[PDB]
Amino acid sequence: RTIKVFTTVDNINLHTQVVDMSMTYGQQFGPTYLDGADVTKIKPHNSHEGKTFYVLPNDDTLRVEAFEYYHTTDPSFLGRYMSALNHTKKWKYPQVNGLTSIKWADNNCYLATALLTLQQIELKFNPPALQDAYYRARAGEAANFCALILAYCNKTVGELGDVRETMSYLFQHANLDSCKRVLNVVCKTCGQQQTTLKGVEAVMYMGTLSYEQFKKGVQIPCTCGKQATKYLVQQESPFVMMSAPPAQYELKHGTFTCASEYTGNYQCGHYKHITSKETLYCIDGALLTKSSEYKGPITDVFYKENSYTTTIK
Numbered sequence: 001r002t003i004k005v006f007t008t009v010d011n012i013n014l015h016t017q018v019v020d021m022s023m024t025y026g027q028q029f030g031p032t033y034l035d036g037a038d039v040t041k042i043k044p045h046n047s048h049e050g051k052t053f054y055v056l057p058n059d060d061t062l063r064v065e066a067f068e069y070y071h072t073t074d075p076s077f078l079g080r081y082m083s084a085l086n087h088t089k090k091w092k093y094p095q096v097n098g099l100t101s102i103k104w105a106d107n108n109c110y111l112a113t114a115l116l117t118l119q120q121i122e123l124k125f126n127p128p129a130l131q132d133a134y135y136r137a138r139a140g141e142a143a144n145f146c147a148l149i150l151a152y153c154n155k156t157v158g159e160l161g162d163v164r165e166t167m168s169y170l171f172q173h174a175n176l177d178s179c180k181r182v183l184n185v186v187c188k189t190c191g192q193q194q195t196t197l198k199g200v201e202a203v204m205y206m207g208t209l210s211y212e213q214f215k216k217g218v219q220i221p222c223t224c225g226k227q228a229t230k231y232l233v234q235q236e237s238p239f240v241m242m243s244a245p246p247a248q249y250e251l252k253h254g255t256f257t258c259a260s261e262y263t264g265n266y267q268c269g270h271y272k273h274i275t276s277k278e279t280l281y282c283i284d285g286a287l288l289t290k291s292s293e294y295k296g297p298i299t300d301v302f303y304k305e306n307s308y309t310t311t312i313k
């Protein structure tokens with residue numbers, strides 16, 4: 001007894017296969033998945049006639065197709081993606097304040113905050129898998145996007161997470177080649193040194209939440225023994241992410257794009273998303289609250305940008 005099915009790694013290039021109904025899928029295809037569900041140790045049923053299956057890349061054609069779609073050669077990626085997708089497809093993705101959020105489940109507070117942020121900054125992903133899922137996420141079908149985010153970050157469903165580390169991984173898979181940042185550090189003793197950063201390092205900074213303060217100057221130890229001052233010289237990027245350890249901060253409407261609120265201890269806390277629309281909105285998964293002012297524990301703030309040059313001589 002034999003049925004005919006499709007195997008794929010990208011759900012674009014399908015490959016017809018013949019499968020013996022007396023052997024498990026793993027004995028003929030290796031690890032095999034159906035809509036994220038592991039069917040490796042399952043004998044083929046009759047309802048599987050014509051359906052499409054994801055398989056781990058076992059030959060060169062599937063390896064090339066897998067990279068062109070996911071931009072990774074890690075053999076385990078597809079499995080971690082499918083294993084995460086089996087859960088994220090059960091989450092609810094309500095529209096909250098014109099954005100796609102996530103109803104709370106499996107400790108996804110940080111994923112919801114990252115998803116809401118990604119929808120408010122200008123970003124193009126290099127892997128076609130990410131870009132396709134990015135689009136479907138804006139339309140409300142964010143399951144594949146969240147599953148891919150977990151896979152690219154080497155995190156699993158249930159694990160707690162950091163929003164800044166998550167954003168950092170995603171930027172590494174985004175087209176930020178045009179982004180440039182020139183910095184200058186003035187040291188009374190040693191002197192002046194001007195560096196330029198490209199890529200992800202041009203849009204992320206750890207230290208202060210204020211973009212204005214970064215323009216004026218921040219205090220940084222010099223390699224000589226004096227506390228030097230660093231300031232921003234040029235910034236060519238569509239946005240900037242300013243992160244700092246959680247501290248009480250005042251967000252003023254219209255001066256920022258969005259922000260991450262963190263309440264709790266290191267590696268054990270709750271995330272909330274603050275966005276600046278006509279007023280200030282706070283999105284906590286499926287819950288929404290509005291207020292004209294906001295003071296609270298903020299760890300990330302996102303600002304819009306295009307081209308900046310300093311007036312400090």
Ligand SMILES: *[C@H](CC(=O)N1CC(C)(C)C1)C(=O)NNC(=O)CCc1ccccc1C(=O)N[C@H](C)c1cc(-c2cnn(C)c2)cc(-c2ccn(CC)n2)c1
Nearest residue numbers: 107108109110160161162245262265266267268269270299
């Ligand atoms: C969400 C949990 C969830 O879904 N819920 C709802 C519930 C209440 C029922 C539980 C979730 O996933 N939360 N994430 C975490 O709990 C883990 C956070 C984490 C993970 C890995 C690395 C770092 C962090 C983390 O704690 N990040 C925050 C932003 C943080 C906090 C501090 C901090 C807090 N208090 N102190 C004294 C320090 C510090 C830092 C930080 C980053 C870098 N540095 C030094 C340069 N400090 C980050």
Ligand SMILES: [Cl-]
Nearest residue numbers: 070071072126
């Ligand atoms: Cl790549």
Ligand SMILES: [Cl-]
Nearest residue numbers: 087090105106
């Ligand atoms: Cl669940």
Ligand SMILES: [Cl-]
Nearest residue numbers: 071126127173
């Ligand atoms: Cl990439």
Ligand SMILES: [Cl-]
Nearest residue numbers: 253254278279
């Ligand atoms: Cl207004």
Ligand SMILES: [Cl-]
Nearest residue numbers: 256257303304
């Ligand atoms: Cl802004």
Ligand SMILES: [Zn+2]
Nearest residue numbers: 071126127173
């Ligand atoms: Zn790539």
Ligand SMILES: [Zn+2]
Nearest residue numbers: 086087088090
């Ligand atoms: Zn589940």
Ligand SMILES: [Zn+2]
Nearest residue numbers: 187190222224
């Ligand atoms: Zn010095």
Ligand SMILES: [Zn+2]
Nearest residue numbers: 253254278279
């Ligand atoms: Zn206002």
Ligand SMILES: [Zn+2]
Nearest residue numbers: 104109284285
């Ligand atoms: Zn929550």
